[PDB]
Amino acid sequence: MNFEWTHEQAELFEHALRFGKELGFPRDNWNALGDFGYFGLPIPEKYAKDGSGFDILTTIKIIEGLGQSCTDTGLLFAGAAHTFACSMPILEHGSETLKHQLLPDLATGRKIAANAISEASAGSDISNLATTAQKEGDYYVLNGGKSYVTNGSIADYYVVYATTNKKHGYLGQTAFVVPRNTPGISVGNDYHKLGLRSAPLNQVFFDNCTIHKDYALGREGQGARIFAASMDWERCCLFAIFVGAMQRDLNQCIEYANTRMQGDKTISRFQAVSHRIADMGVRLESARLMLYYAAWQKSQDVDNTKAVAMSKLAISEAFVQSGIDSIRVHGALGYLDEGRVNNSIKDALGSVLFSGTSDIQRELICNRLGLL
Amino acid sequence: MNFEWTHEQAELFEHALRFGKELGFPRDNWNALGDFGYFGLPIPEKYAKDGSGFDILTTIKIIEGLGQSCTDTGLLFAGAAHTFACSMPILEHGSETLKHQLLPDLATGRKIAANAISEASAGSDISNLATTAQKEGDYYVLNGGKSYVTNGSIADYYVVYATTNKKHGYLGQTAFVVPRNTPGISVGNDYHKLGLRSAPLNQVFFDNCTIHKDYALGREGQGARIFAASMDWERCCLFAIFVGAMQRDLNQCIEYANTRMQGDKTISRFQAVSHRIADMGVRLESARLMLYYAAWQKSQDVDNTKAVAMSKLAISEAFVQSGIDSIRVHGALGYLDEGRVNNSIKDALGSVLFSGTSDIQRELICNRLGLL
Amino acid sequence: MNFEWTHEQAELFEHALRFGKELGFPRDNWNALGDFGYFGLPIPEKYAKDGSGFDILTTIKIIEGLGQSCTDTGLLFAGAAHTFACSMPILEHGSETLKHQLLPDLATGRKIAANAISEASAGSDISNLATTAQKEGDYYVLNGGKSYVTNGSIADYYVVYATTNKKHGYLGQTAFVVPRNTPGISVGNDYHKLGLRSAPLNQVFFDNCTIHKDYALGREGQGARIFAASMDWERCCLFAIFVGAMQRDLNQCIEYANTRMQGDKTISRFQAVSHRIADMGVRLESARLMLYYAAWQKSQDVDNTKAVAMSKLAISEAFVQSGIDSIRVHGALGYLDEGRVNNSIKDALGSVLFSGTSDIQRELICNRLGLL
Amino acid sequence: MNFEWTHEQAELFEHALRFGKELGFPRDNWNALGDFGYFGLPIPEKYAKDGSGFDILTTIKIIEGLGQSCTDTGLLFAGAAHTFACSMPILEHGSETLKHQLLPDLATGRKIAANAISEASAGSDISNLATTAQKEGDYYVLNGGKSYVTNGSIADYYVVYATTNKKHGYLGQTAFVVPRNTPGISVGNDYHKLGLRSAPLNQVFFDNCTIHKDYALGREGQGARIFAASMDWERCCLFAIFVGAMQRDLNQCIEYANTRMQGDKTISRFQAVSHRIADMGVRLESARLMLYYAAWQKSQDVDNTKAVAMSKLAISEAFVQSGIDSIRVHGALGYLDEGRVNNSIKDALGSVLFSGTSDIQRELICNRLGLL
Amino acid sequence: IHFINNDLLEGAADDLDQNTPLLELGILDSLSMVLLLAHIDQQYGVKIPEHEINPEHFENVATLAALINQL
Amino acid sequence: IHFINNDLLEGAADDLDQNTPLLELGILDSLSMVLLLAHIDQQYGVKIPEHEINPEHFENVATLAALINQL
Amino acid sequence: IHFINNDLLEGAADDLDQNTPLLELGILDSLSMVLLLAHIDQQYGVKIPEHEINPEHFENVATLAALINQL
Amino acid sequence: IHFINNDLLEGAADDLDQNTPLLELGILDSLSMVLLLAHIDQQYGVKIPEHEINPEHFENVATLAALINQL
Ligand SMILES: Cc1cc2nc3c(=O)[nH]c(=O)nc-3n(C[C@H](O)[C@H](O)[C@H](O)COP(=O)(O)OP(=O)(O)OC[C@H]3O[C@@H](n4cnc5c(N)ncnc54)[C@H](O)[C@@H]3O)c2cc1C
Ligand SMILES: Cc1cc2nc3c(=O)[nH]c(=O)nc-3n(C[C@H](O)[C@H](O)[C@H](O)COP(=O)(O)OP(=O)(O)OC[C@H]3O[C@@H](n4cnc5c(N)ncnc54)[C@H](O)[C@@H]3O)c2cc1C
Ligand SMILES: Cc1cc2nc3c(=O)[nH]c(=O)nc-3n(C[C@H](O)[C@H](O)[C@H](O)COP(=O)(O)OP(=O)(O)OC[C@H]3O[C@@H](n4cnc5c(N)ncnc54)[C@H](O)[C@@H]3O)c2cc1C
Ligand SMILES: Cc1cc2nc3c(=O)[nH]c(=O)nc-3n(C[C@H](O)[C@H](O)[C@H](O)COP(=O)(O)OP(=O)(O)OC[C@H]3O[C@@H](n4cnc5c(N)ncnc54)[C@H](O)[C@@H]3O)c2cc1C
Ligand SMILES: *P(=O)(O)OCC(C)(C)[C@@H](O)C(=O)NCCC(=O)NCCSC(=O)c1ccc[nH]1
Ligand SMILES: *P(=O)(O)OCC(C)(C)[C@@H](O)C(=O)NCCC(=O)NCCSC(=O)c1ccc[nH]1
Incomplete structure (x- = not known):
């Protein structure tokens, strides 16, 4: 039991504190955070060339430092949504091929991911998702609206949670990475909202989007x-x-x-x-x-x-x-x-x-x- | 001890509740509130032709009704600042001539008043006002900045609180009604602020403004x-x-x-x-x-x-x-x-x-x- | 709408404030409150000779005055439990004969009433009372334990709430006034508890207590x-x-x-x-x-x-x-x-x-x- | 940065949790806590034979364990007042002779210490202590009342804070260990108070108590x-x-x-x-x-x-x-x-x-x- | 009847009909009674007198409907 | 089975048996799963591997009992 | 005068006398005025009219004493 | 000295000088000492040892200045 940071962790924290001053969607600042290493903090080098593969404590300490020095909280929030809700499940549950395909550009911020689960009738309760995914050979067809997607407008990929089997209830949903270029995606304009202006929030609709099964994260259910x-x-x-x-x-x-x-x-x-x-x-x-x-x-x-x-x-x-x-x-x-x-x-x-x-x-x- | 409203007070309250739906600075809505009687509620008929001369309870009940039905709170706030911080001290402490001159148009909202006391260094403590008023014959010369004036940009008159005698401390200040057309007034643009967008908030500077002593409210001090x-x-x-x-x-x-x-x-x-x-x-x-x-x-x-x-x-x-x-x-x-x-x-x-x-x-x- | 007390109400309040200084179970103080008129405030003269028949506002104002001047809060609480939970339902729902029989001594405090509804398994939810009352000719037989009875040890009567018909749920209970001398009542010693020491709190058990149907308050159910x-x-x-x-x-x-x-x-x-x-x-x-x-x-x-x-x-x-x-x-x-x-x-x-x-x-x- | 307890620290914590069940002033329980090692946790072996000389974290973890398992909080509080307000300043500021004389019996609880600073007019502000200590050759004469002394009635020693030089203000007070047998000490009966019944609280008066200068903790001032x-x-x-x-x-x-x-x-x-x-x-x-x-x-x-x-x-x-x-x-x-x-x-x-x-x-x- | 299902029972009890014993099954209680009485006042103009709140009238939807007609 | 009735469903569902579809009827969800997994660990010494949480094993009490036996 | 020292100034200002300029030194302000006016009402039976609150009367204790006498 | 006036005493004590008895008048106390010691550390690079906190050194600004020089 101790509250001591290593010399290295202290150094990284000071680096984060100094980085704050160096700072539509603020794409240039997003890319600057990319170059600093914000989107790669918890990604192993195995999957992204300058991925830091930091442990959780080091990662949160650097993020805290950025939250202190960067006044654009909304921007940090967009970045963390991309990293923790999208890059991490990809890292943890994607096939090896999906990980090598997706993580290098996620890790630098060259590509941006958005997390999509909430719907018109699913918010605090996500037990019953109206968004469906139907198996058809080697592909899934995705159909439904997602209502509050952070990074919706800027996303290169959506991590989308969909019902694959109504009867399996809690164990009847599946996660998919849905590329933005999939025909059938439409995105509403960024909502006007109380805060976090730099983090886009959008409605995203999936109208019979076909994706290859290798885009599934983990197993069906x-x-x-x-x-x-x-x-x-x-x-x-x-x-x-x-x-x-x-x-x-x-x-x-x-x-x-x-x-x-x-x-x-x-x-x-x-x-x-x-x-x-x-x-x-x-x-x-x-x-x-x-x-x-x-x-x-x-x-x-x-x-x-x-x-x-x-x-x-x-x-x-x-x-x-x-x-x-x-x-x-x-x-x-x-x-x-x-x-x-x-x-x-x-x-x-x-x-x-x-x-x-x-x-x-x-x-x-x-x-x-x-x-x- | 009872909590019963008279039939008349109930009627006025319902009238306020219904008025809400009938609704830069929203001047047309300001004038609509003027026609409804918002700025004349506590003004005696003696001083304004359609002044309602309501008692305090009736007046607050109508205002509550408007606060319930009118979604533009900022607008109501502007109106109440004008009525309670400006029209009432005029009513209570103005000469009879000042009252007949000013109240008829204040009461309809045709002219708008702003209250001005806060300064760069006077907010919660208003014991020491840097704004001065110097007597010169039948006139006072006013000099100083007022920092957060609600209705600053739209005001036809400022009720301005100024130091007339430093040595008299608490009893060394005087209130003046300062017409907007007084040479030496300048007003900054409306501040961008968290809420109450319809109520302008402005810096107002008084650069050697000369006004006639009949514009003083009450006595010196x-x-x-x-x-x-x-x-x-x-x-x-x-x-x-x-x-x-x-x-x-x-x-x-x-x-x-x-x-x-x-x-x-x-x-x-x-x-x-x-x-x-x-x-x-x-x-x-x-x-x-x-x-x-x-x-x-x-x-x-x-x-x-x-x-x-x-x-x-x-x-x-x-x-x-x-x-x-x-x-x-x-x-x-x-x-x-x-x-x-x-x-x-x-x-x-x-x-x-x-x-x-x-x-x-x-x-x-x-x-x-x-x-x- | 006003917050003015009548001269009479003010006088009564001042009388309550002065009475505070004139003050096992503090029976002498209980009787002093009886003589002051505490237990008779809302009882009509029709039912008790010095019953004040005050309106609710006058009654609460006097009680407030007593709560201010009498430091024995527990004692006031005992008295109010007796008056409001017991004397009032008797007044509102007792036969005319029950009212003339019971209210005169309740009103002076010569007899003390306790309210009894809570059980081992009924507290916040009183929908299902384990205490039963069975009709037998002109009598009811009451059976069950009541767990937190204020005034339990000192009570001359219990107002007891019992299930008369399980199938009628919410409309299957009945209120009874149970005299203390009814064979089959036993009372535990006063609980030691955090506060309100002067207000006894007790377990009360009703072991096949037979009472005449004229002791029912209101109708069955x-x-x-x-x-x-x-x-x-x-x-x-x-x-x-x-x-x-x-x-x-x-x-x-x-x-x-x-x-x-x-x-x-x-x-x-x-x-x-x-x-x-x-x-x-x-x-x-x-x-x-x-x-x-x-x-x-x-x-x-x-x-x-x-x-x-x-x-x-x-x-x-x-x-x-x-x-x-x-x-x-x-x-x-x-x-x-x-x-x-x-x-x-x-x-x-x-x-x-x-x-x-x-x-x-x-x-x-x-x-x-x-x-x- | 970690929140891991060593195997030894875990063992001690479990030992504290188990000890709780083994439990006027509860002297037998006080002595049982003494035998467990409660009063010796932070005392070096150098000064007390079974003093544990634990670090602060280990010490607080054991105390937490005792606070969890021992329902007599008041008793733990008495013990901690003795250890932390009395044994520790003795350890930190007593002469080597005072430490060898006092700590062995403090560490086992055979002797009990009380901390005494608060007075009739000194509570939150202890800048001006009415209790005085006057130097007379090799002795100090202590005079004054201390108003809320935890362990007052059971204390074998008082750590007493007294004014030695009014003109030195903040740096004009001195700490003394005052043995209970010093003529001129009187102690009032234990106060009745809201909680912590096992921790005596008392008024203690020092009427011209003479003590040898070797009983001073640290230097004058x-x-x-x-x-x-x-x-x-x-x-x-x-x-x-x-x-x-x-x-x-x-x-x-x-x-x-x-x-x-x-x-x-x-x-x-x-x-x-x-x-x-x-x-x-x-x-x-x-x-x-x-x-x-x-x-x-x-x-x-x-x-x-x-x-x-x-x-x-x-x-x-x-x-x-x-x-x-x-x-x-x-x-x-x-x-x-x-x-x-x-x-x-x-x-x-x-x-x-x-x-x-x-x-x-x-x-x-x-x-x-x-x-x- | 739509009312009891939606406002009082919300989720399920899709077996509910004019014979469901409202008191016996705990559907009508001190809280749901308030909402039901307000609905009856709004929807039918009827304010159920105190004497009339009893197990005969509130047994089920049929008997309750019968009371509202009488009134 | 006593467990699911008492801890998870508390009141009623006294029709519950080894065939009740636990997933389909919403009995097992993100919260009740945590309590069930803790019970299984306490009562049987078995810590269900992640791979094994699926609709085949958690279909009903019978299939779940079958998984705990295998483990 | 004892009043101003104890209630209004509490600690120190033990130099205070009938000549201390109360307004000029900030001793009398919006808050202390309320307490002073209440004291004057309690101690002397005098309720100072609004017209009379001015720098002439409240200059110091002597002038204030003079006003209370007049009233 | 500017420091004690601004940070510690804020308003007034414009009579303050190198002879004002800091301890005796209550200017230096448990709270103001912390701020003074931090200032001394920041402004002069000096961390006053515990032994050195005493009435001789903290009598006034002159004696305190003397201690900081020695250190
Ligand atoms: C700035 C912002 C960014 C967002 N970004 C994303 C995103 O990137 N991806 C995404 O999928 N979603 C996103 N959301 C949606 C967000 O996760 C939901 O708003 C949240 O889960 C609440 O859902 P809801 O708005 O539908 O409210 P509801 O679930 O309708 O809740 C309304 C109220 O009911 C209460 N309530 C509901 N259920 C319970 C219960 N069981 N117990 C007690 N109270 C309850 C709630 O706490 C709340 O007070 C975002 C929301 C915001 C504001
Ligand atoms: C929307 C809006 C409209 C306004 N309109 C007008 C207007 O029309 N005319 C006008 O003259 N002014 C106006 N003001 C100014 C307003 O009255 C002041 O903001 C307010 O009096 C506080 O003053 P301040 O902002 O200088 O804060 P400060 O006085 O600097 O206070 C900062 C903080 O210190 C605290 N503080 C200060 N003194 C004390 C004390 N004695 N005890 C405890 N805490 C204290 C405050 O409570 C606050 O937390 C307006 C302000 C706003 C936000
Ligand atoms: C000093 C004193 C005097 C008393 N005198 C009398 C008396 O004279 N006659 C008499 O019959 N009774 C009396 N009682 C009993 C008293 O009315 C109950 O204690 C009270 O109704 C709560 O019941 P309970 O103690 O069984 O707690 P429970 O009902 O077991 O409640 C425990 C907790 O669960 C919460 N809870 C329970 N149901 C709900 C719900 N639906 N929603 C949210 N939270 C809930 C409660 O608020 C509480 O926090 C007395 C109690 C005290 C302390
Ligand atoms: C159970 C118990 C055991 C005790 N044991 C001991 C003991 O062993 N030895 C010992 O010497 N003393 C002991 N005390 C005394 C204790 O330390 C004091 O009660 C405490 O310091 C507060 O002092 P006080 O009671 O005089 O209250 P006061 O200091 O009179 O305070 C009254 C109120 O004024 C507030 N106040 C005072 N000064 C300030 C300020 N600068 N800023 C804001 N608010 C302020 C306080 O916070 C409090 O709300 C004990 C007290 C209790 C209750
Ligand atoms: P269990 O699997 O642990 O499920 C828990 C419960 C049953 C509480 C479940 O209903 C739940 O977790 N509800 C909360 C839903 C939730 O957290 N939704 C967040 C959507 S993503 C989010 O808002 C966001 C912002 C940026 C990136 N993602
Ligand atoms: P006393 O005369 O009763 O003075 C009271 C005290 C000493 C507390 C005084 O300092 C005071 O009242 N401070 C608060 C200042 C204050 O209320 N300022 C408001 C300025 S006007 C306002 O903000 C506004 C909005 C719209 C119209 N006016």
């Missing part, structure tokens, strides 16, 4: 469990972004409360302000430790789902409180867009919905506690 | 107390808007939770959702009663400052929680702009800052409780 | 709805006690924070303390208004269940926060029994359980909001 | 900083008790919610119950990680005060919520003393006061964040 495994990656690693974003919020509030004066004292001298900041620091230390613990536990081959769900919940909830408290501390200036504070709340409110709402995280926690 | 009296009006009546907006949030969440299904039940069947809605209903009943109590008490000529500060605090805090909970209940759809839900949080976060932050309301409450 | 009506009285009026108790907590914290000094200032000068007290004042104004509203609405013959459940919830939750915050404000002195502060939290934690837990109040609110 | 160092030990290690106590609360709630049924389902099936338990699990994982982090950091010779204050705050606040939520989950049964649940809230409310209130922890956090 494994869809639900592969999706669970990809959410284990995403809920764990993607949320490292917001722990960094919260360190930034906190740093900004401390600076401001030490600089801004009202009636001849810094506002730091009012406990309504300073004790508010103290609680941002508390909730942040807590969320960061929970992340580190979930990432460590995920590396131990035990069921780490409880720790991951607790971390996702604590980070995303702390991030909403951080966004609100930063505005409070900054006053009217925080309400103004030029205050450069009000993106935290807009982005944070996304983080308690995507990857499973807070209510779903508590469902998972309750289940892992053994509650009937 | 009364500025601080006239400002307190105008905040008593604004903190009480303007916040009626958000009680209506919260009834709308609640109605939308109940409808949605009864309609939206996940896994073959309405989401209303999950207590994480339904108990969340129950607490929105609780906090709303509470905030509404606190408003009614503050408005009633303000009509009694006792110190009603504690009740008003409690109401402002409870309404604005409930409104932030309502905005967040509405998004939670609606899921991704609430995060999307087309979900027509996410304006509540954006607007609510303004309401805990303007008219004195929540921290300042607690300062006032503590003072009225007799805390040293 | 009406038990569930009579119980709901008695909880409407109890949830509304009994909780007025704790609004008074919270005014006392608040008064004590203001006095203490203005008197106690740390490092040459009163602790009132720290916002961690004073803003904490401000929120006690806010939550108290809110809970009091919610009580007044529920009591007024209950007098209007509309479904007032939502308002009553909101009031019960808000009062009992505010009371728990008040108990905790009073300790915080008082420091070690609040932790010591001689600090005379720590009874609030002990008593408050009872108030979120009895008369339906907070979770059940939210169930009722959700239902009255129309949530499916 | 070092009193404030030695006290800070002892609170660093106590705030860090003593609170490990309550993390164990919270694991017990959580285990009890999970068992109960899986066993107790209302209307033919376990109460675990209501999200009002299960999501409540999920949040107890979240807050507990968080508080435990914060403890581990503070203990690790304390072993690194950096300023670990921020981490310790965050841990003390998070643990003690989580413990209050745990006590309240355990009652809620258990219903009336949790309110009854036989429910064996309601000691958590009674004890928890102590934990947010002693070792510095939550408000003081936030003062320290704010200071370590660099807030002015």
